[PDB]
Amino acid sequence: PSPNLPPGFDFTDPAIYAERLPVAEFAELRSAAPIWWNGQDPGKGGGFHDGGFWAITKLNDVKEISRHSDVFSSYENGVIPRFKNDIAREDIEVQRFVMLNMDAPHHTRLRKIISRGFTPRAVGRLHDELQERAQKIAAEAAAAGSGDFVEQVSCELPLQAIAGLLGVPQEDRGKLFHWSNEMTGNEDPEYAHIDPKASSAELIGYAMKMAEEKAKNPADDIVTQLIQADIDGEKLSDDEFGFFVVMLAVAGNETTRNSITQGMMAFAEHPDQWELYKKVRPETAADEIVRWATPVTAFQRTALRDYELSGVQIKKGQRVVMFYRSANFDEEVFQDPFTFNILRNPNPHVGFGGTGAHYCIGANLARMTINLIFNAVADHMPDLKPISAPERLRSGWLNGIKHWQVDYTG
Ligand code: HEM
Ligand SMILES: O=C(NCCN1CCOCC1)c1ccc(Cc2ccncc2)cc1
Ligand SMILES: [Cl-]
């Protein structure tokens, strides 16, 4: 029995996500075809011209793919499964210069080096400044009376976390945030004029200057740890540091932002959970917010060899797309997946990916950012009420909220 889906339905179609999350359609796949060939017509593959991909809708399958990086490659086609339909292949392949889109051994070396900058100690060192900034952000928003929650509450703290972790001087944080904002969303009419190429080039230029500077003047950020050689001589070259900064500027911005906005939309829809949150401030809330928000709807891999996955024969060269948005609501794994439960524990969501070589190195920074902002929102605008519907982002792989007017005072 084929799944009950519109003909030609494409789970990476940005026009879907500009309007809604295709929740019923994912549930239909989990029930009727949990691994399903998602065909794509010529010219309508979001930059990929291979006729389609396998949709992976079950959490255990997402985990199996993520564990078997020796078979399922990030490098061959990158992990983003949708660009503009006319993107040039060469512009896909430049994604291979960042860790995210690298296979072992190149990935292994870089991840080892980069891990020096995401130690528990490094991230914990940011806690107090980010807590102060969260309080001020929420205080300033509450003072404005009403406004765009996305811009006045969700946007700033993730960017300040990247700035603090890298040690970007305050006067440069405006340009850092601009470069970060120019790298995402170019398929949405609101961002049709952003130039991700120019911004990445400018950011690499900035980052290599910083690398050269912080090498002369060792400062207690992660940068020194990254560009000073270890016993084996291992370190990021200046351009590798630049590629890392580009990666972090993209990774550390919109996904956490959209977690915050959709977490508050969930609280607005589930007032008992919001009352419980305000009273107890459970940090398990962060992971339920990430599960509920699944800010990365999907990442892909490419099979390097034939591989049988839950009874389906995957062929060498085919893409598989891990729909984290489906896996995070998998009825076989979660009890009442469509209940928003901020006490859910354990919460084995794949919002940060499946465990494996490419598991999100920023997961605990994101969780901290989320816990700190919602504490500040509870402290300063406990009674906020939405004014109108969120405006969703046109993207085939990011679950984004562009705008959401709320009354911070109720
Ligand atoms: C709620 C926010 C976030 C979400 C939903 C998220 C999601 C993910 C996912 C799903 C992956 C898996 C990649 C794969 O298997 O192909 C990943 C990896 C990654 N994340 Fe995040 N992430 C978030 C925040 C962050 C932050 C704040 C940072 C950095 C400051 C970050 C940096 C990275 C990096 C560098 C990787 C790639 C690691 C590697 O290839 O070894 N992420 N993230
Ligand atoms: O840097 C990323 N692409 C490569 C960018 N090029 C680098 C060099 O040439 C110019 C451009 C990238 C792509 C997607 C994400 C999404 C994400 C969010 C949170 N966690 C993990 C992943 C982040 C970074
Ligand atoms: Cl559960």
Side-chain angles (χ1 to χ4, degrees), residues 184-196 198-207:
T184 55
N186 80 320
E187 308 205 21
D188 192 286
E190 191 164 342
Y191 311 117
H193 310 100
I194 69 180
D195 180 353
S199 282
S200 64
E202 289 158 9
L203 184 44
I204 293 167
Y206 179 87

Side-chain angles (χ1 to χ4, degrees), residues 288 291 333-337 341 344-348:
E288 187 68 338
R291 186 183 79 83
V333 174
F334 297 97
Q335 198 51 234
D336 292 342
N341 174 9
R344 189 178 299 273
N345 190 349
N347 194 346

Side-chain angles (χ1 to χ4, degrees), residues 100 107 111 162 247 251 255-256 259 295 301 351-353 357-358 360 362:
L100 178 70
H107 172 263
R111 175 128 189 170
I162 295 317
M247 187 178 56
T255 48
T256 303
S259 296
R301 303 282 197 271
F352 292 120
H358 292 279
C360 184

Side-chain angles (χ1 to χ4, degrees), residues 123-137:
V123 171
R125 264 177 73 71
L126 300 172
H127 171 274
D128 286 350
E129 64 188 83
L130 291 177
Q131 170 176 59
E132 164 153 355
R133 292 176 164 298
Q135 294 288 316
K136 183 174 181 282
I137 287 163

Side-chain angles (χ1 to χ4, degrees), residues 130 133 136-137 140 150-162 170 177 253 257 260 369 373:
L130 291 177
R133 292 176 164 298
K136 183 174 181 282
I137 287 163
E140 285 169 350
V150 172
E151 308 193 348
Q152 290 176 320
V153 185
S154 308
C155 268
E156 180 163 2
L157 197 62
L159 293 159
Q160 297 285 4
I162 295 317
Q170 201 71 27
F177 304 176
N253 179 8
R257 178 205 304 187
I260 295 161
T369 303
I373 199 63

